[PDB]
């Protein structure tokens, strides 16, 4: 058994962290007070769930988690709500004034004054690990903390834990729920400084989650609570192999070797099915073939793009519920005859498959119906670069006039970091194109 430390940065990262750890507790039978009756080794153990929870002598299962935010009101809701007993005060770190949607303010001005306290609280958890494998980092692209503090934190983790693996869950900006005009700036700035420090990054476009909630959950105007409960199910799908018995993606290193052959192209596309409203009175349960087919519908992806017009480098299917291999292979056979699935010439056309027999847990009273089987596909497709093209275009429009740039220069950032970051993104866009398109 090797431990994983989760780090939640900023409003988006903290509130998504809330939803995930709630879901984890339901899935593992850990109560809000931290007690877990089914765990018969009291005060310790090296079970699979222990990769995410430590144990006290009193039988309390405590998340290996740090929450960081530069203002207190969002982490104060954790301190005060349903799972207040789960967490040790030392794991919840708040500042006084936030990064004002400004990457430079979160990275340079305010980051400098809190990075040491955070790394010390992270060292507290690392010290109670017999064999830490590394980190899972939740944050938004668009906020000032989520972008600016995270990239500083990522640089320092590479220094202080240079052997360890680092995975991201990143919220990509969507105007239907966005809070700032400058989110394209913050996004590009943080992708540039973080790219070398991340081993695998799962991007979630709020636009995709928003539309999945409207279309498939019948939510007229989704809130962050609607979005986060859906996101947490997907994160749970992705991390279940770290938390349960199995042989696929059992350590953070395997995510990189299964999904990322080229280190810079480390942004797998997630697709999840089925998403069914709990208020749907009559629902016909979907088969292995139907939920697997749905993994190739852009309308079910975490980022709207078109994988028919790129190429795959890897593909992993993560099933939860009543699934056996023969029905997976039958569904894959049919799907390959009917769909444009092109791999790069130097990778095998294939699928790594993981099945956990327990169907997805859903939050009581939440929006998602229980289903007998569900799947999350992780595919490294060059089509996800469509999202970088959208962001870089917005960035170009504002930066050509230097609109809002003075907010960043006034925090000590040099104007040239903007064009450095944007050139890096340009290199990234061209890497994706080399890999995924012929002449």
């Amino acid at each position: 058994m090797r431990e994983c430390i989760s780090i939640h940065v900023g409003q988006a990262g903290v509130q998504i962290g809330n939803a995930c750890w709630e879901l984890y507790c339901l899935e593992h039978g850990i109560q809000p007070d931290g007690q877990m009756p089914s765990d018969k080794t009291i005060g310790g153990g090296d079970d699979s769930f222990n990769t995410f929870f430590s144990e006290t002598g009193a039988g309390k299962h405590v998340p290996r988690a740090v929450f960081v935010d530069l203002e207190p009101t969002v982490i104060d809701e954790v301190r005060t709500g349903t799972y207040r007993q789960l967490f040790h005060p030392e794991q919840l770190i708040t500042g006084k004034e936030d990064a004002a949607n400004n990457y430079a303010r979160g990275h340079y001005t305010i980051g400098k004054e809190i990075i040491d306290l955070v790394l010390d609280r992270i060292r507290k958890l690392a010290d109670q690990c017999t064999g830490l494998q590394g980190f899972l980092v939740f944050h938004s692209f668009g906020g000032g903390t989520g972008s600016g503090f995270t990239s500083l934190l990522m640089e320092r983790l590479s220094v202080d834990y240079g052997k360890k693996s680092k995975l991201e869950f990143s919220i990509y900006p969507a105007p239907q729920v966005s809070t700032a005009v400058v989110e394209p700036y913050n996004s590009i700035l943080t992708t540039h400084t973080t790219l070398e420090h991340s081993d695998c990054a799962f991007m979630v476009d709020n636009e995709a989650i928003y539309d999945i909630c409207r279309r498939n959950l019948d939510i007229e105007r989704p809130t962050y609570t609607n979005l986060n409960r859906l996101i947490s199910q997907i994160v749970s799908s992705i991390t279940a192999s770290l938390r349960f018995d199995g042989a696929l993606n059992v350590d953070l290193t395997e995510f990189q070797t299964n999904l990322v052959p080229y280190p810079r192209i480390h942004f797998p596309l997630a697709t999840y099915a089925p998403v069914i409203s709990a208020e749907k009175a009559y629902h016909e349960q979907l088969s292995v073939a139907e939920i697997t087919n749905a993994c190739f519908e852009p309308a079910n992806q975490m980022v709207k793009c078109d994988p028919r017009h790129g190429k795959y480098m890897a593909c992993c299917l993560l099933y939860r519920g009543d699934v056996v291999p023969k029905d997976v292979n039958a569904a894959i056979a049919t799907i390959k005859t009917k769909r444009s699935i092109q791999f790069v010439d130097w990778c095998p056309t294939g699928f790594k498959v993981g099945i956990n027999y327990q169907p997805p847990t859903v939050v009581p009273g939440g929006d998602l119906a229980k289903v007998q089987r569900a799947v999350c596909m992780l595919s490294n497709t060059t089509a996800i670069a469509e999202a970088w093209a959208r962001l870089d275009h917005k960035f170009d429009l504002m930066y050509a006039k230097r609109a809002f740039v003075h907010w960043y220069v006034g925090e000590g950032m040099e104007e040239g970091e903007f064009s450095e970051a944007r050139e890096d993104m340009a290199a990234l866009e061209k890497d994706y194109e080399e890999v995924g398109v012929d002449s």
């Binding site: 809070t179 429009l397 609109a403």
Partner: protein, 427 residues
Amino acid sequence: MREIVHIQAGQCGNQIGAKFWEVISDEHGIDPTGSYHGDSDLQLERINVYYNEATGNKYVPRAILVDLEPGTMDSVRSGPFGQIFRPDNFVFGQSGAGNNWAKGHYTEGAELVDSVLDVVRKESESCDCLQGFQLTHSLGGGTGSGMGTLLISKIREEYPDRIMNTFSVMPSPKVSDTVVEPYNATLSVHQLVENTDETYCIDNEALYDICFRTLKLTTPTYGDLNHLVSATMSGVTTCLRFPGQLNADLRKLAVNMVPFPRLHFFMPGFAPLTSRQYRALTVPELTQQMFDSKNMMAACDPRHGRYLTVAAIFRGRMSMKEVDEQMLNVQNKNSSYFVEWIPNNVKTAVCDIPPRGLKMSATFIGNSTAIQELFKRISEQFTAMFRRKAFLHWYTGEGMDEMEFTEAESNMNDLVSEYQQYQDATA
């Protein structure tokens, strides 16, 4: 980012300041004595942005009242909420400023300003995390204009890393006390361009026309003008006073609204326009009205320029689905008026508590390049007098040189040219 320190200066600033504190005290369930008597905890969740807590469950506005005459502040002390203000926070002279920017900035106001900053300092020191300052004042008189901008300069010196926000009433010959108002306004704008982060331009021209044409008030009074101002002020501070996601503090507002440091003069709007009616307003009607030039408080034609950024705030129980749909319809059906080199430059907030006497309302805050019309207007009235050096002796008698007038005029004309730059820029 919690506490705001509020300063009101001069006759106009104190009269609208008092009405502002009346209106938001009612929204927060605070009564004339500082006692809370409300039905919702949304009323108190962010009460400390504007109010201090004194023992006895008493809420005391974080408000400093400044004037060079005692007259208008005696009136505040006697008005309906006059008892709620902290008595030490009344800082007044006796001299008056004679509608004279030089007296407010350089002679009479210089005598009084250190005592004002003693009170500002004492309020700042009791702040867990001070966001900055809001000032209400006019630009056409002497105290609000000249001493107000003096205060802003001194506050920036002592707190250079906090946000400075003003509500600035622009003079108009239609609602006019003296002929020197264009001088005082031009000198003030010069200060505002350098030392505030966000300025709501409240045009006495627009407020008069709304009272005349729209609300069918034949002879508008300052009382009728200030009802429009206190309602607009309540609207533009909603995001600071209630829990919410968007523009919830002064610095995030500035980051969303100010793409270039000097271009920070905002055109506010309000819907539905009410005088001091029972028909319900639909979300489509709120949305068409808040964007209507006839609901703008700065007398500028929005079609004569382009929107750099817009902040919209909707108040009341209504459908957020319909709000988002209607906001999207405005931008998509008049897209040419929103600059295309700032994507998604329109941000929208909804708060469940409406203002008094309405079930639904909307407040508009636009950074339009059409605001240049306001400064061009002041600049023409300035020049018409200044080319004959008319009425200058009232200023040179206080130590000022003509060169200071020439510089302030030039800087304001530069501000006009910088707005015209971005109105034509295409991407």
